[PDB]
Design a binder for this molecule. Structure first.
Ligand code: CA
Ligand code: CA
Lengths: 585, 585
């Protein structure tokens, strides 16, 4: 086999504890290059003559070009050393260790996970493991209070087509008046984009971190919201913009007024004074040349303490976690310490970050709890919506992703289908509900945290920003209640089937030709299989199911009861029809 | 080219800054699969249609199975995204990016280094970059005061053969009196193994972390050592053992007496009560069943603060750094915070850890400065002493290990030939001085910090523990001043050639049959190439040297002048001879 293609490291996403005494190990090799992977391990101080423990590494998945093996090691000593034994299609065996490769186990060496400290066990809030988040764009969700609408606000109508400078008066009061709705839908948390004192429409340039923007409400209204949401079993998530502030931030305006006399001059990155100019900037900002967004020096103790204080103020109000913006642009020390602050105030506080690239460096367990799973969307958009990729490709994109980070993180990734910065997925589906409904079925049954974008649930459509930010449709007769009930049922199923929230993921079937994909979610002895027929034609498939995994399945969506015969399960799926098979365990 | 064998990551040892605006990048590939590696980069926020930067990745070296390419990206924005352009033997062009491989740049995606914060640019003390450490085991170095010799201390003789419980009276005063000797040798720093108050002989079971063991001296004596040593240009590095404490440790004893009602019960890992027993361990300890060494609970804030106070104390005495024992078993959060303390107290304090396996997780820049380079010892023992490997294998082992951690670490790794836990290298060489010297010449010219074990500079030989703890031979008549002088010359040269202390490493030539190896240290324009004739036979070698690096070289050890012609340098080395050719720049 190609040893130069096999990889592993005693850390990161290939070696990490899941418990105080259990070490997980991942090993990858060229697809087809290895057939069996076994792990021999023992305590690091074990006598060189003592016998080693054995652990079989199952094929956890495979992507475009790699094979992935995962095994669980029992380390009662909390210290472990181990070597890999890899067997090829031709029985050729070889040990893989820290030293390298060899036919003799001794010469291969041994990887070592020094010690497993309880504090370094990746731990995330339980309520998040089986949660469903609903993304709220305040300015467009509900106008509960007309008295705070900004001047020039436009009529709230379904036919309205938002313009970049539009206003609709969306506010926190509406979110409250509509809480019965979210509860009915079944969401367990609301994620709000920025809503803090700011002069712009987007509010990404914070002016006052300790205050709700007047057009949205006030502390009183916010406290009311949090309280009314909680008694409804709904957590609250706010957006944290700590990378940069607005040009009206008290600390910045002082520097604009006092130049080097400002006690806050080092709260930013300035090249020379005076500090200011239009189309030109003598201080670092978000992206390139954005005057309204002066970068904050999160490395500075003053800045750090201040934001940490800002977090305390809002955590005092009862929020349940944060969504970090441009998180990847603030120092790690800051994030490490922030989590400590946050987790000590609330062990169940969530920390979700937004990185548009491999976020492993932030997802080891000492910083964020998870991040937005943009990969999920990319694979989902192209699979159900544009159809640029087929089922076998879709399977790969997904798998490659799962093995990207530790399970504690993969399990909590926010899987969104769109956002306030993208065209609505229904539109991406060219308006076809058959395609949209299928995707949502997948979103609601896959590994991670489903993130619902306001309105998608009743079938709102629209191009990218700002057309995706159309005012929420509240007239029941103008809403797609058929769709609305679909989301409800999917959400209800996801709540009862433990496998769907806390189960692993395994690919079941991938037909590049028929474009049908299947996977199974597992927890304990329970198994739930999902079959997706992504084609505008009726198709029939043959899935394999050895009696050991059950002999009869019940389609949780239709009640239909199918039986497997001779280790196979015959299934006929209707156009864009999805099936969710439960084995009753 | 086996694509499944190419590796990279925008973190760790494959992507790291060397300055606030300079990012280093490394790529791994199957040997021979890539002949040209170039990187195309731009600002993370740069427009799509903007001209991409170019940076050629030179081949940094190769090992047993891989090739390694390196590049330095100029990133004025401290923000960068990049894509690799790989060229094979047959001219095939493949792009490599976060998304994967493709003949098209757009489909390859791009790796991203989100942001470069100065607080994250690996930084190590300046004096350690040109330092030459000297390992001292107090008990066997020198007896400056017999009044502290424990009963049973034996005579100080060259032919003395120490037993496990022997006592010679080595003490700090002794070190003081011998400072002139050490200063002459040219060592710039002194490293003491544990020397704190302990009831045992080895002193690994700390009883009083705030006091020097009476057998070595008193606090006032240590102070005398630091000042007198400092004025000779010699630093002091103390060995700290925080993973576990002694069974006589004040905090521990409180539990042995008050049992469960011990105010310090949560400071350790205690299974059940009574708190202890003989030959049987009912509490976690170092290794397996070590009643005198109960593991300290560093995860505990009370312990952390205490160990830190202990740290502050000794740093207030003026020490210059720490050598951590069994550090790989202490939580990272602890070390991260330890560094912050130590460094704030003294930015020049050194933090060297001891971990016998891939320590990348501790060598990112937020924890240790370096570790003992055990891989170096193995490469020198098998190449110089046992002859287990030839010149080509030596080359690989060296190359592979060099590429394990970021350059800032590699440059400051402690390169030891032996220690209080092994036999004298001379013993490993079977008494062959011609071999010992060549290994030392390499040690003195390779990348890393040379570690000299007390006595080795005067040719002390001996078997492993306790024979490696033989009393220092101070009788000049009995000293191999011949070797001693050699040691001196190398140390001098090292201090005069910036490239030997701060330059990189590149293999120059390797021959498995002739057993001849050569490498080049380069810094700015200075080049110094080392040629090793590791064979007991006079050999001639033809090295390739384009006029670019110079056309004339000088052997610093003999003063011989060598000239190159048509890009070749013909050198004749005597049995086991090594040359150090300076390009005069
Ligand atoms: Ca309003
Ligand atoms: Ca003495």
């Amino acid at each position: 086999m190609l040893l130069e293609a096999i990889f592993h490291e005693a850390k990161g996403s290939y070696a990490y504890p899941i418990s105080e005494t259990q070490l997980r190990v991942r090993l990858r090799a060229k697809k087809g290059d290895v057939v069996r992977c076994e792990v021999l391990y023992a305590d690091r101080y074990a006598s060189p003559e003592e016998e080693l423990a054995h652990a079989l590494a199952g094929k956890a998945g495979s992507d475009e070009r790699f094979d992935y093996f995962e095994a669980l090691l029992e380390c009662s000593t909390k210290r472990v050393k181990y070597v890999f034994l890899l067997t090829g299609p031709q029985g050729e065996a070889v040990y893989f260790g820290e030293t390298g490769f060899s036919a003799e186990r001794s010469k291969a060496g041994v990887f070592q996970y020094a010690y497993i400290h309880r504090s370094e066990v990746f731990t995330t809030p339980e309520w998040a493991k089986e949660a469903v988040i609903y993304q709220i764009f305040p300015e467009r969700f509900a106008n509960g209070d007309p008295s705070n609408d900004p001047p020039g606000t436009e009529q709230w109508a379904k036919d309205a087509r938002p313009r970049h400078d539009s206003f609709y008066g969306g506010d926190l009061k509406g979110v409250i008046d509509r809480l019965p709705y979210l509860e009915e839908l079944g969401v367990t948390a609301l994620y709000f984009t920025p809503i803090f004192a700011s002069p712009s429409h987007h509010k990404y340039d914070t002016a006052d971190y300790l205050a709700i923007d007047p057009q949205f409400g006030d502390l009183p209204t916010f406290r009311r919201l949090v309280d009314e949401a909680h008694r409804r079993g709904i957590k609250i998530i706010l957006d944290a913009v700590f990378n940069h502030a607005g040009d009206q931030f008290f600390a910045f305006r002082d520097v604009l007024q006092k130049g080097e006399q400002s006690r806050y001059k080092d709260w930013f990155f300035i090249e020379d004074f005076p500090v200011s100019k239009t189309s030109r900037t003598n201080y670092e900002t978000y992206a390139v040349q954005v005057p309204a967004m002066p970068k904050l020096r999160t490395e500075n103790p003053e800045v750090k303490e201040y934001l940490f204080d800002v977090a305390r103020f809002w955590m005092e109000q009862g929020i349940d976690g944060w969504r970090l913006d441009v998180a990847n642009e603030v120092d790690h020390a800051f994030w490490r310490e922030f989590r400590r602050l946050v987790k000590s105030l609330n062990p169940d506080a969530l920390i979700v970050g937004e990185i548009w690239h491999d976020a492993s460096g932030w997802l080891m367990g000492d910083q964020f709890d998870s991040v937005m799973n943009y990969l999920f969307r990319e694979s989902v958009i192209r699979f159900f919506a544009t159809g640029e990729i087929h089922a076998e490709r879709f399977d790969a994109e997904l798998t490659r992703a799962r093995m990207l980070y530790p399970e504690q993180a993969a399990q909590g990734l926010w899987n969104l289908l769109d956002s306030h910065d993208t065209e609505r997925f229904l539109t991406s589906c060219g308006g076809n509900e058959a395609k949209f409904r299928l995707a949502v079925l997948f979103q609601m049954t896959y590994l991670g945290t489903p993130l619902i974008y306001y309105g998608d649930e009743i079938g709102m459509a629209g191009a990218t920003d700002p057309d995706c930010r159309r005012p929420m449709i509240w007239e029941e007769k103008e809403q797609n209640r058929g769709l609305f009930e679909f989301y409800k049922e999917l959400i209800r199923l996801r709540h009862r089937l433990a496998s769907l929230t806390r189960g692993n993921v395994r690919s079941w079937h991938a037909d590049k030709q028929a474009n049908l994909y299947a996977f199974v979610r597992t927890v304990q002895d329970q198994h739930v299989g999902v079959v997706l027929n992504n084609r505008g034609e009726k198709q029939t498939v043959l899935l394999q199911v050895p009696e050991s995994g059950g002999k009869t399945w019940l389609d949780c969506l239709t009640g239909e009861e199918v039986h497997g015969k001779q280790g196979q399960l015959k299934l006929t799926l209707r156009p864009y029809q999805g099936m969710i098979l439960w084995n009753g365990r």
